[PDB]
Amino acid sequence: PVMADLNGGLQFVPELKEFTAKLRKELVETSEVRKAVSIETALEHKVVNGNSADAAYAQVEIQPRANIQLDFPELKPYKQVKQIAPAELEGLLDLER
Amino acid sequence: LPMSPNHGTFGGDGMYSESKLSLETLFNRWHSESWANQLTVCGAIIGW
Amino acid sequence: YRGNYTDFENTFQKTVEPVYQMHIKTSKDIAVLRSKEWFQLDDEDFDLLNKTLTFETETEVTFKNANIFSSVKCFGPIKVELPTKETVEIGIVDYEAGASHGNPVVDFLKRNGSTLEQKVNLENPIPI
Amino acid sequence: IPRETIPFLHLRKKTPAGDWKYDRQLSSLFLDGLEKAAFNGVTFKDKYV
């Protein structure tokens, strides 16, 4: 039997449980502190500038309507449609047949 | 076999660590028991 | 005075705010306080953990219109309660604004502080 | 592989004491196998899985 170890050296970190828990705690407490400061600065802006200087920041969104097209075939300019057919074709076909 | 280095380290995972660890018997069994010719056991301790 | 006045430049309001007392129990409160530009300690490295800061502010307001201000200037010393129960100044409010719809200093203190004494209603009013 | 440096991906060998310990020789075989794979690609023809 072969015991492969693909752990990536994680076995050498002591008390991994509490060390992952620690790291997660520092990311969480840094995210919550910077939220609780951004929400204070927002409130202070809203009290100093009221609802009229913070109303200019609200843009008008356009919402799409359905514009159901009949999907007619696009006609190219005459130079473009003249290039695909052989130059001999003009006046060759009986356009009633 | 999908092995783990976690053996009740993290915990709070019902019986995962029990299931993972109990596949380590298959190393010794491959010698003691008579199925060597039909199955080879390659544990793979799978990391983060 | 019953009448139609519009002498806003002559109007003013030099209120003395009620002393707001804030208990800094955590280290998030510290980051919130230090984010404020009006909050200015004399010693910038002062340890704010497990303290009792009293903000004795004096807020003057000169008006522009009936519903907005022109000059807002909250200011006052920020004390700390010592173990000897004597308050010592450790900084100042230095709030100065122009065209404002309020005072953020008294707003902030109201939302996060106490009034040194609390009005607690009875279960029922008593007809004396 | 440096001397007295365990690679990230390695194989273990059973010690007579009855424990699995890092073997340099096996881990070298495995890593050579992974190299060749990552250079020339590996083929699993005639392999039911």
Side-chain angles (χ1 to χ4, degrees):
Chain A
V2 176
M3 183 94 94
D5 177 79
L6 319 180
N7 200 8
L10 189 80
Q11 63 272 25
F12 293 117
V13 181
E15 51 266 12
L16 182 56
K17 176 190 156 71
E18 74 83 60
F19 173 77
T20 46
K22 177 178 179 65
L23 273 177
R24 190 201 331 290
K25 194 181 139 286
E26 281 95 57
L27 265 64
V28 160
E29 71 96 350
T30 282
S31 161
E32 299 306 8
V33 159
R34 291 182 189 190
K35 265 182 186 198
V37 160
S38 178
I39 295 313
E40 276 284 8
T41 59
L43 286 180
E44 179 150 310
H45 271 325
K46 284 289 297 302
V47 158
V48 163
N49 287 336
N51 298 117
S52 43
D54 292 41
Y57 207 73
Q59 273 63 242
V60 176
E61 298 99 2
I62 290 307
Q63 288 279 14
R65 301 294 175 91
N67 190 34
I68 297 136
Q69 288 296 8
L70 284 197
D71 275 355
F72 274 46
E74 287 208 270
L75 297 159
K76 308 186 155 44
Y78 186 58
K79 296 299 95 179
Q80 291 191 43
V81 297
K82 197 56 175 149
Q83 284 162 26
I84 75 161
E88 287 63 23
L89 198 44
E90 189 175 40
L92 190 51
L93 301 184
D94 181 347
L95 290 186
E96 299 165 294
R97 294 297 299 263
Chain B
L1 311 170
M3 293 288 324
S4 192
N6 171 218
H7 298 307
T9 299
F10 295 82
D13 55 354
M15 301 154 58
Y16 175 88
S17 312
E18 289 66 4
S19 314
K20 291 291 136 192
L21 181 62
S22 297
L23 301 175
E24 298 211 28
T25 68
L26 290 178
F27 298 89
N28 302 330
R29 282 172 79 106
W30 186 94
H31 304 294
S32 92
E33 296 228 315
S34 47
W35 49 259
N37 300 320
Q38 291 76 349
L39 307 155
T40 72
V41 179
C42 177
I45 304 152
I46 288 150
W48 195 286
Chain C
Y1 285 79
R2 181 64 96 199
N4 184 256
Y5 309 97
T6 61
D7 58 299
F8 293 110
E9 64 281 322
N10 300 331
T11 57
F12 74 92
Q13 184 166 6
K14 300 201 260 197
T15 317
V16 167
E17 296 303 322
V19 177
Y20 288 110
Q21 193 179 59
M22 199 198 316
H23 276 72
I24 310 299
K25 308 214 72 180
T26 83
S27 57
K28 178 195 300 187
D29 285 297
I30 294 175
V32 166
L33 267 187
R34 296 293 180 85
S35 83
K36 299 305 188 175
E37 187 188 304
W38 57 255
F39 194 81
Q40 289 181 189
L41 298 164
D42 56 47
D43 183 68
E44 213 78 353
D45 285 34
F46 194 91
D47 178 15
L48 283 181
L49 196 46
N50 313 321
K51 304 311 222 304
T52 299
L53 308 191
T54 53
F55 299 70
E56 45 269 342
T57 59
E58 277 197 26
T59 316
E60 83 85 12
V61 175
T62 85
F63 290 65
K64 180 196 172 196
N65 314 134
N67 54 355
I68 205 176
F69 313 149
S70 81
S71 160
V72 188
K73 165 159 293 305
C74 191
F75 62 90
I78 313 151
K79 282 163 170 62
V80 69
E81 191 185 13
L82 289 191
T84 67
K85 203 181 82 148
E86 76 186 329
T87 56
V88 167
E89 178 269 329
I90 59 155
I92 58 174
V93 183
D94 183 30
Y95 190 70
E96 180 166 334
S100 308
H101 296 225
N103 183 0
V105 174
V106 170
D107 169 52
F108 173 80
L109 287 161
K110 261 182 183 148
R111 277 195 285 89
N112 300 282
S114 41
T115 46
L116 317 182
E117 300 179 326
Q118 287 284 1
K119 181 65 177 72
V120 60
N121 304 7
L122 291 181
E123 55 86 36
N124 287 316
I126 307 161
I128 290 179
Chain D
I1 300 166
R3 201 265 174 284
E4 286 203 73
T5 302
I6 295 176
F8 281 133
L9 314 179
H10 70 268
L11 304 187
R12 298 189 219 286
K13 166 181 158 47
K14 208 190 166 55
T15 58
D19 187 19
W20 295 87
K21 273 206 53 45
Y22 164 73
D23 187 301
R24 180 172 197 97
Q25 188 49 48
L26 297 183
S27 303
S28 284
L29 264 70
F30 176 58
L31 263 291
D32 291 346
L34 278 187
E35 197 187 23
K36 271 160 58 193
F39 272 99
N40 307 318
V42 62
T43 177
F44 302 121
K45 193 167 53 53
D46 300 315
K47 192 168 284 286
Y48 307 172
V49 181

